[PDB]
């Protein structure tokens, strides 16, 4: 689930591109500061849309560049707790499977998969159940719920989300339809 923000911040225009229009020149500075950075307070800042209005310049002793107070629009993504998500199985591991719910991934361990005793087939990339002949393999569209989020650093790459599907009405979508009756 994505959100759209409207946030003011102080913009630092260098004197190299000092002779451009103020709108897009303040846009090109603030865009290459926040894109692709996971904060622990709000989340993944994806991209800057546009710059509405801008203030005047103020010179500071020592640098020679200028300061402004702009208005811009930010598309964020916040994977908050116990949020019902949708994803795609894009990884096969012997201890679990990464479910891509967007820019990040969601790991479900092998014993939170389903209401079945689960054995990992080592030769293939699949799970085979004991009683039922259901097969969970690569590329299958699933539905899950967040249960734990491990936030370590500012980088998107180093943070992983644990989910689970041991609830009525989750898993693969054609498994869900036959559980309606």
């Amino acid at each position: 689930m994505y959100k759209l923000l409207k946030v003011k911040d102080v913009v630092r225009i260098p004197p190299r591109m000092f002779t451009m229009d103020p709108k897009e020149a303040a846009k090109i500075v603030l865009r290459e500061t926040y894109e692709g950075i996971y904060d622990r307070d709000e989340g993944v800042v994806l991209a800057i849309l546009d710059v509405e209005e801008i203030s005047e310049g103020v010179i500071v002793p020592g640098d020679g560049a200028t300061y402004h107070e702009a208005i811009f629009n930010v598309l964020v993504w916040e994977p908050r707790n116990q949020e019902v998500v949708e994803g795609e199985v894009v990884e096969m591991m012997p201890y679990g499977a990464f479910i891509r719910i967007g820019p990040m991934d969601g790991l479900v361990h092998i014993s939170q998969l389903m209401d079945d005793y689960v054995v990992f087939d080592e030769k293939n990339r699949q799970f085979i159940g004991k009683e039922t002949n259901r097969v969970l393999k690569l590329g299958d569209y699933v539905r899950a719920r967040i249960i734990g989020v491990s936030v370590k650093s500012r980088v998107i790459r180093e943070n992983k989300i644990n989910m689970t599907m041991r609830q009525p009405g989750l898993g693969k979508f054609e498994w869900i339809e036959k559980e309606k009756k």
Binding site: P14, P15, R16, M17, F18, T19, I59, G64
Partner: protein, 56 residues
Amino acid sequence: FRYTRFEKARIIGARALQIAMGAPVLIDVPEGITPLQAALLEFEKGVIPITVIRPS
């Protein structure tokens, strides 16, 4: 609206630092000039862009 002696020596100081970091020059060329002396000639013709703030 005449400047004082403290404001005239700061406007030159800030403009001589922009003129070294890029900030394309007006008609000031000839043949070799230190960046401080470029700010004095631009100030002579009265084409400085920087204006002061008068706190009151």
